[PDB]
Design an enzyme around this catalytic site. Structure first.
Site, PDB file in Angstrom:
ATOM      1  N   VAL B   7      10.527 -12.881  -5.902  1.00  0.00           N
ATOM      2  CA  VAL B   7       9.548 -12.496  -4.891  1.00  0.00           C
ATOM      3  C   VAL B   7       9.581 -10.982  -4.737  1.00  0.00           C
ATOM      4  O   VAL B   7      10.633 -10.401  -4.448  1.00  0.00           O
ATOM      5  CB  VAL B   7       9.823 -13.192  -3.550  1.00  0.00           C
ATOM      6  CG1 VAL B   7       9.012 -12.543  -2.443  1.00  0.00           C
ATOM      7  CG2 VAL B   7       9.505 -14.672  -3.649  1.00  0.00           C
ATOM      8  N   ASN B   9       6.946  -7.374  -3.420  1.00  0.00           N
ATOM      9  CA  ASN B   9       6.046  -6.996  -2.337  1.00  0.00           C
ATOM     10  C   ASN B   9       4.625  -7.481  -2.599  1.00  0.00           C
ATOM     11  O   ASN B   9       3.912  -7.860  -1.663  1.00  0.00           O
ATOM     12  CB  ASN B   9       6.067  -5.480  -2.145  1.00  0.00           C
ATOM     13  CG  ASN B   9       7.372  -4.984  -1.555  1.00  0.00           C
ATOM     14  OD1 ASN B   9       8.098  -5.736  -0.906  1.00  0.00           O
ATOM     15  ND2 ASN B   9       7.676  -3.712  -1.778  1.00  0.00           N
ATOM     16  N   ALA B 110      17.567  -6.836  -3.915  1.00  0.00           N
ATOM     17  CA  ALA B 110      18.140  -7.904  -4.726  1.00  0.00           C
ATOM     18  C   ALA B 110      17.660  -7.836  -6.169  1.00  0.00           C
ATOM     19  O   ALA B 110      18.413  -8.187  -7.087  1.00  0.00           O
ATOM     20  CB  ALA B 110      17.800  -9.264  -4.118  1.00  0.00           C
ATOM     21  N   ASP B 111      16.431  -7.363  -6.391  1.00  0.00           N
ATOM     22  CA  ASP B 111      15.929  -7.232  -7.754  1.00  0.00           C
ATOM     23  C   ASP B 111      16.746  -6.215  -8.534  1.00  0.00           C
ATOM     24  O   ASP B 111      17.014  -6.405  -9.726  1.00  0.00           O
ATOM     25  CB  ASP B 111      14.450  -6.841  -7.743  1.00  0.00           C
ATOM     26  CG  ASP B 111      14.203  -5.507  -7.070  1.00  0.00           C
ATOM     27  OD1 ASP B 111      14.748  -5.289  -5.968  1.00  0.00           O
ATOM     28  OD2 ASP B 111      13.468  -4.676  -7.643  1.00  0.00           O
ATOM     29  N   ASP B 131      12.224  -0.735 -13.903  1.00  0.00           N
ATOM     30  CA  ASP B 131      11.466  -1.917 -13.521  1.00  0.00           C
ATOM     31  C   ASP B 131      10.144  -1.456 -12.920  1.00  0.00           C
ATOM     32  O   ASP B 131      10.126  -0.815 -11.865  1.00  0.00           O
ATOM     33  CB  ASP B 131      12.276  -2.764 -12.543  1.00  0.00           C
ATOM     34  CG  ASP B 131      11.597  -4.067 -12.186  1.00  0.00           C
ATOM     35  OD1 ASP B 131      10.496  -4.357 -12.698  1.00  0.00           O
ATOM     36  OD2 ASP B 131      12.186  -4.821 -11.388  1.00  0.00           O
TER      37      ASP B 131
END
Lengths: 261, 261, 261, 261
Positions: B7, B9, B110-111, B131
């Site tokens: 998940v 934004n 967390a990503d 990323d």
């Protein structure tokens, strides 16, 4: 002695310029916020409130607007408030001495035309103008003085505000240089990203233009000049930008006024 | 058989993983939107619609989120609609085998932790992970697996959309590679900006990290890998990035799932 | 000598009226913006800045407002700053010599009644008043001075701005007359659309009014007069409207002030 | 047997067309809200949910978008979900048999090109297409098939919503024909304006095109066809519009698809 109005999407720059040609200097400059729905009378009131007693000693007015509604209001204000004072307006579709070797010359911005004119007047060689406005505009000017185009990247503050607005966790962080590129907190990481990354954006665009476009290589003489309010922040971190000129748009407007009269 | 949830934004990536350890591969990946206010009902409905017949064949459910409300909804839908299938949930502030040598380990996304874990597991050396998500997140991993930090630049699409929205003369454009760095029309100028400028932005961040940090120099062995949806577009232009791994976040979710059981 | 206030939803027009009855002629008209959140102090400051030394020579004050809060602020600023000056305040539901033959005379805006009174005073016959403001308001006045009704189409500038904002390809455009009705680019097409289409809109409303209402046919004697800021832009294109009177609302305020004392 | 996607700024039209060439008819049609942020997987899911069991009998797919982001997602969805099924995509500015005698052909909308091609295929003469979209687009087609341009006026509902949103007194009312042009209350006057004024806008635009452009006058044979969702609302009140083809865009998409095989 000359009043120059430069309306951008975010801020408007009002300038009093004295002298002619080589001796032309920006003796005074104010920066205000722009409202897209301001009227001619409000605009004239605030311009007079800024320039004080200089309003009766103005010898000319030169204006450009990137917002079309404000351009309309500027037309009405110039025709009404200063009738004896001669006026020039930068409207798309009218030549200003800089050829536009671009597909759609009628939609090239006014600020970009003025910046290219000023830069090629000052340097008289191939140039790359990096205007740090609401967008970062990279303008490429050949040695003969044409406008080959460039790039329109997102600006620093605009992109940072958009990133902070998308995420509720992120907050509005002032644009400043951090300690190092590898930050140690969210504020420091965001500042490092915006500052060092947009410096790298400018450097990568400039280096790509120099590599890919003939006549702009390192073996050629290229005048790489920045302008815009946020330019001094990213200026230390750039490795490709040589010169800085805070009054490039004002001097281009002065050149436009001088050539139109 | 492993349901991996990522998940962000703006977009959420849902994947199915078949196998374990090296035999774990991604068989199906889908990209949908995210709503901060959506609930477990619609999320369960769209998860079932995406996975088809695989809703009754799942072995584990690994999730990560950046929006807390979406994470809570994922909690409720996994505890309601999948009671038999075990779940691992990743929130900022829980160790995943990568020490968070940062001033505030609680606030690290967390990503970033998951991608750092996946890249260190894949390469077992110093790693640089770019990323391209809603924000371009640059992360550096030590040669021993310590997470140092990095940068949070604005995203390519978010920045281009913000530039289009804020400027009256600028319109929304499709994110694609143009013919050259020097645009010959407004669409091509904005595309050249968004693509080449952000490629240069990532190159600048990576190069400054390698120059200004000990152990990340050119003479050292550093694995520099990009991820994200826009990563295949900017990858031919990135000079400092070698590898691409589209499933790095999903592989990291698999690694966390195998480690937490 | 008479301070006339015309408050609209977008622009407020402030006028100085010199004389009385037939000798009352507007010498100074100023168009400024309006704020729903404004208070008496800022309004008094901008009024004084507009009128200069004429603030001490005011004989009477006339006010009409379509916004309630702005009218309340005008009440407070006239009570505070001009105690000796007589003031007339126009609100819907109070007769001004024009019977409001409407199903709900309370809902009729004050500007409509004032323009109807001014046009019936000038022409003394059946009248069709076209007022280009935030909304193009067409009103019809009988041959005996009754207000029957009319139409309220959207305004030219508001609608062109909405069309620009709702579309990705459409950008904001300066409202102007193009070369032809058939445009050759997006800006030219949007200007042709807005200007010629709202000319057709006003022509159609006037023609439908004349054909579908007894007493307003071509065989009768009806004066069709345009008012508003954008009215000189559409006047060369309108074929039904005959007269232009820029100061109609201010003259109506003068008439109301002279009547109510 | 043919799936056609027509993405507009407000609504997307999905259509199933069975048969080829003269025998081609629209067997089913759906209208959904457009989402500028929708993804390829969500769009394919909703297309499948609309078309039911027909997904396994499609022979071709053809699509256009006026929203660039949705166009990107449509590219990904057509590449992914129907690989064997041939597809055609309308990238604006590419020849479809209708030459674009416009200053910048790459900016002409996809919908305008497709509507012009369908109208010229059906009528084979000089045509005027009045597409009642989010904005009222008037497209002129020569007797030789050329697209000469036209006009882009603000749409009916968008302009009415803007007028209502500016003022607190004015609210969002249904778009229906009133009892008369001369209303008797605010709602009736607003509806009279919205309906009859925009009918007059369309009539005046068409009349000015016929009067001012050679080959389109009353003595010439001109097909004046309306299309779009709100076209039947103003069709009773129009005098210049002859025909009404509600499937003009789907038939044009089918024609382009057949010309690309």
């Amino acid at each position: 002695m000359l009043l120059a109005i430069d309306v951008r999407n975010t801020h408007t720059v009002v300038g009093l310029l004295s002298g002619m040609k080589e001796h032309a200097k920006v003796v005074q400059q104010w920066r205000i916020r722009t409202e897209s729905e301001v009227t001619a009378d409000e605009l004239a009131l605030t311009i007079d409130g800024l320039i004080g007693e200089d309003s009766e000693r103005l010898t000319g007015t030169a204006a450009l607007s990137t917002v079309p509604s404000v351009l309309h209001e500027v037309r009405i204000m110039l025709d009404q408030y200063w009738p004896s004072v001669p006026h020039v307006l930068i409207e798309p579709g009218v030549r200003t001495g800089i050829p536009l070797l671009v597909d759609n010359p009628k939609e090239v911005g006014a600020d970009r035309i003025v910046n290219c004119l000023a830069a090629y007047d000052r340097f008289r060689k191939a140039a790359i103008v990096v205007d740090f406005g609401s967008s970062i505009c990279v303008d490429v000017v050949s040695a003969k003085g044409e406008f080959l185009g460039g790039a329109i990247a997102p600006g620093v503050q605009v992109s940072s505000d958009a990133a902070a607005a998308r995420s509720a966790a992120l907050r509005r962080v002032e644009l400043a240089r951090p300690r190092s590129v590898v930050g140690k907190n969210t504020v420091e990481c965001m500042q490092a990203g915006a500052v060092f990354g947009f410096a790298g954006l400018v450097d990568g665009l400039v280096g790509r233009i120099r590599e890919d476009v003939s006549g702009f290589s390192v073996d050629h003489d290229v005048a790489i000049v920045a302008t815009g309010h946020t330019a001094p922040l990213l200026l230390p971190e750039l490795h490709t930008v040589d010169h800085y000129d805070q009054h490039l748009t004002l001097q281009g407007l002065r050149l436009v006024f001088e050539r139109n009269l």
